[PDB]
Amino acid sequence: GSSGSSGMDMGNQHPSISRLQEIQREVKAIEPQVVGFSGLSDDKNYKRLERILTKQLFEIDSVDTEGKGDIQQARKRAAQETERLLKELEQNASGPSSG
Question: Backbone phi, then psi, for 10, in 5-degree steps?
Fold first, then answer.
């Protein structure tokens, strides 16, 4: 529903957190690039967009958790987020999702 209750104090930036943070800002920085997209399903620029997500996503799965909710959550939270946009594209493109 709303995950907002956790602390954070330690001298060390997990290699998984930074990643998600480096992959999240991407899908987010491109979130609008898709929502504000305008191209048929696979026109020329549709690839890039998708590629991004596809790339970012592939990175999400690459992000190890090691059984760390803090991470697991984000990751999984990014695994769905990324795909989400991806889906949008298909729609934002011009054609319907499925019908």
Answer: 180, 145
Question: How many of the other CB atoms lie within 10 Å of CB of 68?
Answer: 14
Residue 38 one-letter amino acid: S
Closest CA to 25 of 49, 65, 58, 56: 56
PDB experimental method: NMR
Q: How many CA atoms lie within 13 A of 78 on its CB side?
A: 32
| Per-position b or e across 2-17, b if 16+ CB within 10 A of its CB | eeeeeeeeeeeebebb
Closest CA to 51 of 77, 68, 33: 33
Q: Where are the beta strands (DSSP E) in the chain?
A: none
- Contact (CB, 8 A) for 87 and 97: yes
By the 8 A CB rule, do 61 and 49 touch?
no
Can you give the residue ranges of every domain in the chain? 1-99
Domain 1-99, CATH class in plain words: mainly alpha
